[PDB]
Amino acid sequence: SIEWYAVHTLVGQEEKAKANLEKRIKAFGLQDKIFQVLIPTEEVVELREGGKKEVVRKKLFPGYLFIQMDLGDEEEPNEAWEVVRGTPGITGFVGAGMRPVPLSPDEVRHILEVSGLLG
């Protein structure tokens, strides 16, 4: 019933925007609308010896952030959008038709499988 709202951000600051953002979402109390918050980055594990392990991930969608929120209120989204639009980790939007950029189901499964949900 919900949807994956994806928005644009600053390159390099995205990783920092998550903390500054996630905090505001919990500080104000918006955990009821936002459920998931996956990052457009592929995971890759690499080990050489036992004891020490280093795992990294490649960002497929730069400056992109997929959030399975619930903006399906009625006309316009809830305060959740205001928080993100005001968070230090926000610059603007795609600049096409609307402010956000909801992904499609067929696309979500593809961006979620790479993130770390489906596999």
Swiss-Prot record:
The keyword Transcription applies. GO terms for biological process: DNA-templated transcription termination; regulation of DNA-templated transcription elongation; transcription antitermination; transcription elongation-coupled chromatin remodeling. GO terms for cellular component: cytosol. Transmembrane segments: none annotated. Keywords: Transcription, Transcription antitermination, Transcription regulation, Transcription termination. Participates in transcription elongation, termination and antitermination. Belongs to the NusG family. This is Transcription termination/antitermination protein NusG. The gene is nusG. The chain holds residues 2 to 120 of 184 of the full protein.
